[PDB]
Design an enzyme around this catalytic site. Structure first.
Site, PDB file in Angstrom:
ATOM      1  N   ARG A  50       0.846  -1.176   0.000  1.00 36.43           N
ATOM      2  CA  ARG A  50       0.000   0.000   0.000  1.00 36.43           C
ATOM      3  C   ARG A  50       0.885   1.230   0.000  1.00 36.43           C
ATOM      4  O   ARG A  50       0.632   2.216  -0.665  1.00 36.43           O
ATOM      5  CB  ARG A  50      -0.994   0.043   1.139  1.00 36.43           C
ATOM      6  CG  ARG A  50      -2.107   1.065   0.959  1.00 36.43           C
ATOM      7  CD  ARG A  50      -2.869   1.117   2.271  1.00 36.43           C
ATOM      8  NE  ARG A  50      -3.839   2.178   2.302  1.00 36.43           N
ATOM      9  CZ  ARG A  50      -4.102   2.986   3.316  1.00 36.43           C
ATOM     10  NH1 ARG A  50      -3.455   2.908   4.477  1.00 36.43           N
ATOM     11  NH2 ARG A  50      -5.038   3.882   3.121  1.00 36.43           N
ATOM     12  N   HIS A  54       0.710   4.324  -2.948  1.00 33.23           N
ATOM     13  CA  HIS A  54       0.364   5.647  -2.507  1.00 33.23           C
ATOM     14  C   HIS A  54       1.547   6.553  -2.701  1.00 33.23           C
ATOM     15  O   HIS A  54       1.332   7.736  -2.884  1.00 33.23           O
ATOM     16  CB  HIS A  54      -0.056   5.810  -1.024  1.00 33.23           C
ATOM     17  CG  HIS A  54      -1.467   5.470  -0.745  1.00 33.23           C
ATOM     18  ND1 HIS A  54      -2.138   5.957   0.365  1.00 33.23           N
ATOM     19  CD2 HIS A  54      -2.316   4.682  -1.442  1.00 33.23           C
ATOM     20  CE1 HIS A  54      -3.366   5.455   0.316  1.00 33.23           C
ATOM     21  NE2 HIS A  54      -3.503   4.684  -0.756  1.00 33.23           N
ATOM     22  N   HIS A 177      -5.966  -5.670  -4.021  1.00 31.04           N
ATOM     23  CA  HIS A 177      -6.945  -5.605  -2.956  1.00 31.04           C
ATOM     24  C   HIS A 177      -7.217  -6.966  -2.374  1.00 31.04           C
ATOM     25  O   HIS A 177      -8.178  -7.178  -1.650  1.00 31.04           O
ATOM     26  CB  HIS A 177      -8.262  -4.927  -3.368  1.00 31.04           C
ATOM     27  CG  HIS A 177      -8.112  -3.465  -3.155  1.00 31.04           C
ATOM     28  ND1 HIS A 177      -9.074  -2.539  -3.508  1.00 31.04           N
ATOM     29  CD2 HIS A 177      -7.055  -2.805  -2.615  1.00 31.04           C
ATOM     30  CE1 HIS A 177      -8.585  -1.345  -3.175  1.00 31.04           C
ATOM     31  NE2 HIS A 177      -7.378  -1.473  -2.639  1.00 31.04           N
ATOM     32  N   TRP A 193     -10.888  -8.774   2.151  1.00 26.60           N
ATOM     33  CA  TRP A 193     -11.473  -8.987   0.864  1.00 26.60           C
ATOM     34  C   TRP A 193     -11.656 -10.462   0.550  1.00 26.60           C
ATOM     35  O   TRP A 193     -12.354 -10.851  -0.369  1.00 26.60           O
ATOM     36  CB  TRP A 193     -10.531  -8.352  -0.150  1.00 26.60           C
ATOM     37  CG  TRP A 193     -10.657  -6.858  -0.309  1.00 26.60           C
ATOM     38  CD1 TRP A 193     -11.650  -6.250  -0.993  1.00 26.60           C
ATOM     39  CD2 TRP A 193      -9.800  -5.801   0.149  1.00 26.60           C
ATOM     40  NE1 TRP A 193     -11.484  -4.897  -0.990  1.00 26.60           N
ATOM     41  CE2 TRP A 193     -10.359  -4.586  -0.302  1.00 26.60           C
ATOM     42  CE3 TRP A 193      -8.620  -5.742   0.893  1.00 26.60           C
ATOM     43  CZ2 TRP A 193      -9.785  -3.333  -0.039  1.00 26.60           C
ATOM     44  CZ3 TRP A 193      -8.061  -4.505   1.149  1.00 26.60           C
ATOM     45  CH2 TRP A 193      -8.636  -3.316   0.693  1.00 26.60           C
TER      46      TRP A 193
END
Ligand code: HEM
Length: 296
Positions: A50, A54, A177, A193
């Site tokens: 992540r 980002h 994800h 998920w």
């Protein structure tokens, strides 16, 4: 005054080669294996991925602002972006590492961790390149370039455009994800998920297509797609399925892990390199061996 897009030239850390990076790698890699208790034993892999995204995700193709290059995340402005809530854990894990190899730039280390996390989680091999140079604080991009979650297929397509990603790119990348999960406190979103959330596989597409999804409201008061199996999906996620265009990529990837990993590997590397002009004399992308491959 006129806005020429900046040009960011990759300059390899003075005197470093393949072998040096591989070392940074193994460190990150070993520390992943060692700090296994993080987040309910999910580990630091997903957060690390992540973090790489980002940091690259601030990119704006038009004026060449944001992106991996500068390692501007090390600054407050960026560091405190409400969009990067939770990322401090990754910063925190990468630190000691930066201590051990103080000579590596921040963009380079941050990007590199994602790659590691990917490979270390049994995902594909992602060719990487060194050369990002830390930039001063004024070069930090204002908050808000990161996608919102409570949107749709239209927004997601329009968004990725700013990063030069196409539909097949968008769907490939979204598959990440399948890692980690949502923490209300970070995002107003809660839940995983799917089941194998620290092993990179195509679980996200399958789930998307085989579960019974229902729009509910979380404790945060937002809406999310909940499956009875205890999983969840963001609206932006669920959208990969409402768009007809999106939907057949999902099917293709749920159908072939293999294609999926090639497509992702190529796009994730792109995300991490957006904005950088590598000199032609520059070297090729390295491809790190995993610990396993190394007997470590
Ligand atoms: C529409 C685009 C995106 C949106 C709206 C979205 C938003 C989200 C949200 C809000 C979370 C939960 C954060 C938290 O509460 O901890 C999440 C988690 C995460 N995101 Fe995304 N995401 C985006 C794109 C992607 C991209 C392209 C990547 C990587 C290639 C990805 C990788 C991750 C991963 C691996 C995590 C798990 C984080 C953790 O477990 O702490 N996301 N993202």
């Amino acid at each position: 005054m006129i806005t020429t897009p900046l040009v960011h030239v990759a300059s390899v850390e003075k005197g470093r080669s393949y072998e040096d990076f591989q070392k940074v790698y193994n460190a990150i890699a070993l520390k992943l294996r060692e700090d296994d208790e993080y987040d309910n034993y999910i580990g630091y892999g997903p957060v690390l991925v992540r973090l790489a995204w980002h940091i690259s995700g601030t990119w704006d193709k038009h004026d060449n602002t944001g992106g991996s290059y500068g390692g501007t995340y090390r600054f407050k402005k960026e560091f405190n972006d409400p969009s990067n809530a939770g990322l401090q854990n990754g910063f925190k894990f990468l630190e000691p590492i930066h201590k051990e190899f103080p000579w590596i730039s921040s963009g380079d280390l941050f990007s590199l961790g994602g790659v590691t996390a990917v490979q270390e989680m049994q995902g594909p091999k992602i060719p990487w390149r060194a050369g990002r140079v830390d930039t001063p604080e004024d070069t930090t991009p204002d908050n808000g370039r990161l996608p919102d979650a409570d949107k749709d297929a239209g927004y997601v397509r329009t968004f990725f455009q700013r990063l030069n990603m196409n539909d097949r790119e968008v769907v490939a990348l979204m598959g990440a994800h399948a890692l980690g999960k949502t923490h209300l406190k970070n995002s107003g979103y809660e839940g995983p998920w799917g089941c194998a959330n620290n092993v990179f596989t195509n679980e996200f597409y399958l789930n998307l297509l085989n579960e019974d999804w229902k729009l509910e409201k979380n404790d945060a008061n937002n809406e999310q797609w909940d499956s009875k199996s205890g999983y969840m999906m963001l609206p932006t996620d669920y959208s990969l399925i409402q768009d007809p265009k999106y939907l057949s990529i999902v099917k293709e990837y749920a159908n072939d892990q293999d294609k999926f990993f090639k497509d992702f590997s190529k796009a994730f590397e792109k995300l991490l390199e957006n904005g950088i002009t590598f000199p032609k004399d520059a070297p090729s992308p390295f491809i790190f061996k995993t610990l396993e491959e190394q007997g470590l």
